[PDB]
Amino acid sequence: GLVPRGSHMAKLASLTFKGNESVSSSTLQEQMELQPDSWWKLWGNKFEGAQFEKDLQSIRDYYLNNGYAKAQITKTDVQLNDEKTKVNVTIDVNEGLQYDLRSARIIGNLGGMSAELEPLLSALHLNDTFRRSDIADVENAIKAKLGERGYGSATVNSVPDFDDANKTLAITLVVDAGRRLTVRQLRFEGNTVSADSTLRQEMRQQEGTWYNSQLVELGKIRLDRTGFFETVENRIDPINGSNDEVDVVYKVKE
DSSP states (O other), rough: OOOOOOOOOEEEEEEESSSSOOOOOOOHHTTSSOTTSSSEETTTTTEEEHHHHHHHHHHHHHHHHTTOTTTEEEEEEEEEEEEEEEEEEEEEOOOOOOOOOOOOEEEEEEETHHHHHHGGGGGGTTTEEEOOHHHHHHEEEEEEEEHHTTTTTTTEEEEEEEEETTEEEEEEEEEEOOOOEEEEEEESSSSSOHHHHHHHHHHSSTTEEEEEHHHHHHHHHHHHHHOOSSEEEEEEEOOOOOOSSSEEEEEOOO
């Protein structure tokens, strides 16, 4: 069967990094929400892995945003005390080399937008330190561009080619525009003040026709500008057993 279990707290006593020759322990620790002297929730001899994993990902993101494209978290060790108070964490990193971005290319299924996607690669800083977050920004710009023509589910995947001798890397962005999508319904979540049909009236994406990322964004803007909402967000909802139709959902927090 299933049985209830309750949690106790223990303080994160020490944070130790191993293998980080080029980036300081203090800088790595700064990427983490879990800091020494903060409390760690334990259940029996189990710890919450969710936040720790996000902290490990922030460490990875830092390396990848500062040129260390092959950086890996090699091992982690969460140890207790005998006393159920104080955990001590050890994180091993393999930093690898710091790379410059030498080139970037787009390939794949481009939904007829090859010429309009190419100029987006200009945002990148060639012959400069590789920065993952710059690539991620190009990926989102590619998706927004393809969204103009209905390809609201386009995927982009960055594929590296490493030159360790010269400490450069080449990026191939593998794009799959996917299918042109038709919007079936515009749906609103979180709205109590105004009826769904009232909000729908402020949207510029229309139901029953092609998704257009520009008109979808414009609705989110038209809601943001009123000031009536803490957050405005939108997403694409797949429809069971369709590959060609989707719903667009606007999530407001009042």
